[PDB]
Design a protein around this nucleic acid. Structure first.
Lengths: 225, 458, 166, 374, 32
RNA sequence: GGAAACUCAAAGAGUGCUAUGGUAUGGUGACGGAGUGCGCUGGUCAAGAGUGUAAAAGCUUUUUGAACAGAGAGCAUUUCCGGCAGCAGAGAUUUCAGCUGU
């Protein structure tokens, strides 16, 4: 039970079920001892002559041509039978029947922004060191010596044109996620009133731990551990 | 669960170009279930939408739609809409720049000479009529009918509800274009100087001064989606600006010559720019493709506007011409002026009107109604354009029936949730994410001569 | 747990059902002490389940004297036996909030499954329903409660002093 | 807002009701804007039970249109999908909300009970029991709710034990109106009549008496007398012995007029021992009532009970064989009355003669009767 | 799928149809 | 400064109004109703056990069993119904209530 309580989306902290007593009805007696003079009079008469209706169950628990001809005594017994008698009669008919059956220019600005991109191929290859620079007297070849790569903002074959607020975005990926695809799939839907329906807004904003505001929280008890 | 209109309510996400954790796996599964449930239940609200959009449909092949007259519309529609189609004949001061409040309740007109009037155009209640005898250029409301900013001879002034002057801005030296950013509380200003200035109306503080570096600002529009400003220069260049970067976010080569007007869709997807080379151009904003290039207009389009339901209202002097479904990708949505032999694949005008006396100053659709308010040389005229307004507003964004108490509390609440000016990016969904540096996988600190061969050993 | 509430008043008896408990430990705090003045939050605590009105000013005076000297009358017995559930007498009694610590013993003498609470939590619940009165009852009584209060106060006083008009 | 919650609770049934091809989208938007109007009027301020009633009537009308359109389009009588119970469930919840908001109009409570009973097999009798329980909790003094509750649970379900419990609890609450007393003696006589008729029927195919009705008759007299002497002379007993005896006489008149109505609507139960069950009320009225009904005033009532005791066997038709059997009993009654009375002697003689002449070849045996009662 | 007169009557109630209302306003012609 | 008001706005204070979802209808045939079984409540009796004692009595008991009285406050599953007529019955021409087979 500890695992399902850890995995449950919502814990409603009246969690041990309160022992609900039988409701105060107006169809019965909420004390089961005679409470008025009328009640004790009626019960002493009714215990002089009891009316638990076991006799009135066995009297009406007795009743082809029984189906066709008896269309008057059937209605008479239907009017005559009491509550549990009619329940048993319905059960007997149910069991009997169930036993019976079964734009050319636009390219210059595009070309300029391509040039202000794409890995920024600088060369400071060596200005004059080692090899007698300046005023004639050429050196040897392989003046390759410095082609370092300051990284452009986007590489040339990874745009889509070929086919102050870095404090409003988080520094790294936070703990429970493993990549920013997962984490932004968490952030992708707004829980606001303006963007969801009312039912979806309520489902999105109800908290996990929901306690009652003025009653004691008892420790958990399980069905035999 | 299927919901034929979900992709309006869908939400894009990051992709890489599954997990072994049990708790994280079930957390992501709950998140995907909640996203699907939320999209479905949010898209089921289109049953609850009260009203239906307007239209007009030809019902014959002899009955073209651009040759339907405004008097014929006013006879065919109800008395409330016919009374909304107002007309003020204000002859003596100059051409009237029109402006509506963001719910369509108040109208703000400015004469070129001096006459600025803020009014409730649909009752008969004006609440400011002030004659500022120097040449005014433009005005806008700020967050209400209660304050408006006017761009005067040089300085931009800010007036209260009844017209008393609240502020004279010593910066904003020569404005010709003002626009308010309502979620950010920013008055944006551009004009004859090559400078773009963002001014916080709530605190009172000039947020940004940006060198356009391209001379005077010929046109100016605001993306309602992400609050970046599209300015049109005398190069034929639109540039998209934010108050964080001192350089434009993007520079597009829209037209030849200068750029006469810019309009943006409210979905932030399409932009229509008219140049002075008689060229209307429809642009994709998100992917920066050029969708349509209507070249050789008969006379240069002096204005464009885009309604809330995507109509395109171009104005070329005396003429106003509206196209329906022109902001779409296909070449059959290129706005034509006639259909050569009855081609169904040619976007002829949805409706047209001729202001025979004059030359129109500016265009503006009335926000939640089916009207187009055009301000011209002799005042104001609303046009009943039936396809041209969101029939189902949201009444807790901005409400056309809002009361005085609702205005007060909504003013305090939007003032409280004012977005900072640094959150303005080219896409709005980029302030929850991680850096585009700072590697996409989180790190777990664990990851944090046979003689010479003999002479070797020497 | 303060599950039910018994409010006696000149028009009859009222049994309320406590929806939300108020705070026990923070019961002296400012917000808890003025939530019983605000009606919009008191209706989150108290709900009316029953109101048995009196048969007239005669039964009103009888029940005023019985409530005054701390006895359960027959109309009290009727409404409590209608409304309170048949709980146990040895394990988790049903909890009734009264305002009279010597009426409590007369209630447990008649219903042993009822434990009665009149401490400061039941006292300010009771004075919340006294402070709001006619608004809690949702329109179900005959007679204005202050007019019945004037009649019952004059009747109680003349009875207690034996005022003879001869 | 909560109108938004209720309105978007209304959407899955019209999802289903558009999928089952009976309604279209443009007409279901019309029923949603009408339902939006109604839900906003319900849970806004200044609300009315007429707003609740008009919403219930609108929902019943769209239910009837839905049934008609289902029979005309799909040619089934229910689609066994969500959209045939959701709207009746909505009506039941509008009723529950209305009775929680305005629990004071018994017209609305009884419309709730009528719709919930007439919903048929689909409802639950414990669901009717719940709203009977909370209605009887809120209105314990209103007595027709007790009669209606017990009438539903005897004249539909035939639950004698629970019906006896309902009547005893109602008589616990308001033991002051005689109407609940009369309906309880009516229920007990109906129960004992059904008992002896099922005995007669089991005999014809193949102890417990009206003394219950007599005992509740006895406590009816005692407690109705107690409550009238407590109701009148209200505050105090500041009244001299003239006013005390005037009061006690008037309570005897009140109680005896109610027992006159008791025998008047007691005679028509003629399938049990009606003679014994009327004679026991006769002997219960014959005794002393502490203020000399016989030996002093209410002598007219004494003469009325004497006339009743005389004709108590002569409650017969024009076939007067019982008169030819025991008219000497009536003669001895008239002689025993005129042996003491002074003007009631002549009154009882003329009244018994007029009664027998009005109630009774056939005129020749009636000529014998006229010679007898002349 | 035919029409029906009772169905169209209570459908005119449920959908809030003022079509017969405008028909009667156009029809009644001040005949008295 | 003054006067007028079914004038137009900007704000402040107080009062009134059930102003009531502590986690929203009894039910997306995935369902409902009926019945059964399990579960639950109360008192009574009996048994156990402790404690006490000469024996007791008494008192305690989250120990069990029995019949009784119930609650609507839970959980199953194929036990039936929400299929069709024929027929009588029920209430105000619509709905409601059982027998013989599909």
């Amino acid at each position: 039970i500890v695992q399902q309580n850890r995995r449950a989306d919502h814990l409603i902290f009246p969690l041990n079920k309160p022992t609900e007593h039988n409701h105060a009805s107006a169809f019965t007696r909420t004390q089961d001892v005679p409470q008025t003079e009328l009640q004790e009079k009626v019960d002493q008469v009714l215990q002089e002559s009891n009316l638990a209706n076991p006799e009135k169950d066995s009297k009406f628990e007795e009743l082809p041509e029984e189906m066709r001809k008896r269309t008057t005594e059937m209605r008479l017994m239907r009017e005559l039978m009491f509550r549990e008698e009619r329940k048993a009669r319905r059960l007997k008919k149910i069991k009997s029947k169930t036993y019976r059956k079964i734009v050319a220019e636009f390219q210059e600005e595009k070309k300029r922004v391509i040039d202000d991109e794409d890995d920024k191929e600088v060369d400071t290859t060596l200005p004059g060191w080692g090899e007698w620079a300046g005023a004639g007297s050429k050196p040897k070849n392989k003046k390759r010596k410095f082609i370092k790569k300051v990284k452009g903002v986007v590489n040339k074959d990874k745009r889509r044109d070929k086919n102050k607020n870095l404090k409003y975005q988080s520094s790294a990926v936070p703990f429970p996620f493993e990549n920013r695809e997962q984490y932004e799939r968490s952030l992708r839907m707004p829980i606001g009133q303006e963007w969801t329906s009312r039912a979806s807004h309520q489902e999105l904003i109800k908290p996990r731990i929901m306690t009652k505001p003025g009653q004691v929280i008892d420790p958990l008890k399980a069905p035999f551990k | 669960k299927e919901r034929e209109n979900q992709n309006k309510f869908e939400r894009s996400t990051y992709t890489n170009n599954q997990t072994k954790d049990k708790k994280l796996r079930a957390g992501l599964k709950k998140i995907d279930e909640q996203y699907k449930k939320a999209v479905s239940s949010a898209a089921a609200t289109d049953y609850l939408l009260p009203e239906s959009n307007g239209y007009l449909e030809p019902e014959n092949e002899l009955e073209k739609t651009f040759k339907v007259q405004q008097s014929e519309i006013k006879s065919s529609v109800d008395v409330s809409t016919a009374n909304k189609a107002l007309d003020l004949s204000l002859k003596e001061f100059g051409p009237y720049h029109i402006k509506y409040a963001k719910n369509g309740t108040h109208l703000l007109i400015t004469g070129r000479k001096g006459h600025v009037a803020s009014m409730d155009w649909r009752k008969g209640q004006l609440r400011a009529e002030l004659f500022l005898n120097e040449t005014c250029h433009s005005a806008t409301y700020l967050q209400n009918e209660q304050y408006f900013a006017v761009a005067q001879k040089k300085y931009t002034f800010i007036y209260d509800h009844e017209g008393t002057e609240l502020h004279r801005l010593k910066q904003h030296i020569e404005a010709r274009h003002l626009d308010f950013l309502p979620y950010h509380y920013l008055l944006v200003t551009a004009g004859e100087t090559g400078w773009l200035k963002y001014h916080d109306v709530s605190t009172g503080q000039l947020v940004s001064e940006l060198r356009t570096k391209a001379g005077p600002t010929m046109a100016m529009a605001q993306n309602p989606w992400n609050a970046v400003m599209h300015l049109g220069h005398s190069n034929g260049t639109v540039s998209l600006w934010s108050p964080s970067m001192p350089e434009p976010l993007v520079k597009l080569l829209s037209a030849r010559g200068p750029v006469n007007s810019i309009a943006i869709d409210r979905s932030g997807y399409y932009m229509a720019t008219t140049g002075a080379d008689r060229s209307m151009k429809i642009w994709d904003i998100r992917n920066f493709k050029q969708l349509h290039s209507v070249e050789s207009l008969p006379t240069p389009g002096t204005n464009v506007s885009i309604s809330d339901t995507g109509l395109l209202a171009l104005s070329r002097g005396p003429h106003v011409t509206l196209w329906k479904d022109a902001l779409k990708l296909s070449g059959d949505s290129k706005p034509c002026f006639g259909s050569m032999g009855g081609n169904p694949h040619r976007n002829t005008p949805y409706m047209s009107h001729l202001f025979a006396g004059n030359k129109v100053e500016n265009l503006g659709f009335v926000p939640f109604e089916d009207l187009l308010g055009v301000g011209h040389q002799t005042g104001i005229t609303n046009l009943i354009v039936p396809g041209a307004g969101e029939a189902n507003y949201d009444a807790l964004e901005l409400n056309p029936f809002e009361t005085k108490k609702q205005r007060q509390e909504q003013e305090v609440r939007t003032l409280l949730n004012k977005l900072p000016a640094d959150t303005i990016t080219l896409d709005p969904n980029s302030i929850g994410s991680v850096d585009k540096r700072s590697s996409t996988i989180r790190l777990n600190a664990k990851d944090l001569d046979v003689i010479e061969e003999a002479l070797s050993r020497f | 747990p303060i599950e039910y509430l018994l409010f006696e008043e000149p028009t009859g008896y009222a049994v309320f059902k406590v929806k939300l408990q108020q705070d026990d430990i923070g019961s002296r705090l400012k917000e808890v002490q003025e939530q019983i003045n605000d009606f919009g939050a008191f209706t989150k605590l108290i709900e009316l389940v029953s109101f048995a009105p009196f048969k007239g000013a005669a039964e009103a005076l009888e029940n005023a004297n019985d409530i005054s000297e701390g006895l359960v009358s027959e109309s009290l017995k009727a409404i409590l036996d209608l409304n309170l559930p048949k709980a146990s007498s040895k394990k988790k009694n049903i909890t009734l909030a009264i305002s009279d610590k010597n009426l409590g013993p007369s209630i447990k003498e008649e219903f042993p499954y009822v434990d009665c609470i009149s401490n400061e939590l039941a006292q300010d619940l009771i004075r919340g329903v006294r402070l709001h009165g006619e608004k809690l009852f949702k329109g179900l009584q005959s007679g204005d409660l202050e007019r019945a209060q004037l009649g019952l106060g004059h009747a109680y006083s003349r009875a207690k002093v034996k005022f003879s008009v001869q | 807002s909560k109108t938004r919650y209720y309105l978007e609770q209304c959407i899955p049934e019209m999802d289903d009701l558009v999928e089952k091809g009976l309604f279209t989208k443009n007409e279901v938007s019309l029923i949603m804007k009408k339902r939006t109007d109604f839900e906003h009027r319900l849970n806004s301020r200044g609300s009315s039970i007429n707003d609740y009633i008009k919403y219930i009537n609108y929902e019943s009308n769209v239910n009837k249109l839905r049934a008609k359109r289902c029979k005309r389009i799909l040619q089934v009588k229910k689609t066994n999908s969500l959209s045939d119970w959701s709207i009746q469930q909505r009506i039941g919840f509008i009723y529950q909300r209305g009775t929680n908001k305005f629990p004071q109009d018994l017209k609305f409570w009884a419309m709730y009970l009528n719709y919930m009973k007439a919903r048929g097999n689909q409802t639950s009798y414990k669901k009717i029991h719940n709203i009977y329980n909370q209605l009887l909790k809120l209105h314990p003094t209103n007595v027709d709710i007790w009669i209606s509750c017990a009438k539903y649970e005897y004249e539909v379900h035939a639950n004698f034990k629970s019906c006896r419990n309902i009547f005893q609890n109602g008589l616990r609450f308001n033991p002051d109106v005689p109407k609940l007393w009369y309906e309880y003696v009516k229920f007990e006589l109906n129960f004992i009549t059904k008992l002896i008729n099922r005995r007669k029927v089991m005999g014809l195919i193949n102890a417990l008496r009206g003394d219950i009705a007599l005992t509740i008759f006895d406590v009816c007299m005692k407690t109705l007398g107690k409550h009238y002497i407590n109701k009148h002379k209200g505050y105090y007993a500041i009244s001299d012995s003239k006013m005390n005896i005037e009061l006690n006489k008037e309570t005897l008149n009140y109680l005896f007029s109610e027992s006159l109505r008791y025998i008047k609507l007691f005679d028509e139960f003629l399938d049990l021992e009606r003679d014994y069950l009327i004679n026991h009320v006769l002997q219960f009225w014959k005794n002393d009532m502490y203020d000399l009904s016989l030996r002093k005033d209410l002598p007219e009532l004494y003469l009325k009970t004497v006339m009743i005791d005389i004709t108590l066997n002569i409650r017969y038709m024009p076939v007067e064989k019982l008169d030819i059997d025991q008219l000497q009993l009536s003669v001895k009654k008239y002689f025993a009355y005129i042996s003491k009375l002074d003007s009631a002697s002549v009154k009882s003689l003329k009244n018994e003669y007029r009664s027998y002449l009005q109630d009774n070849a056939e005129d020749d045996p009636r000529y014998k009767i006229l010679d007898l009662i002349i | 799928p035919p029409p029906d007169e009772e169905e169209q009557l209570l459908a005119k109630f449920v959908f809030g149809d003022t079509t017969d209302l405008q028909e009667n306003l156009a029809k009644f012609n001040a005949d008295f």
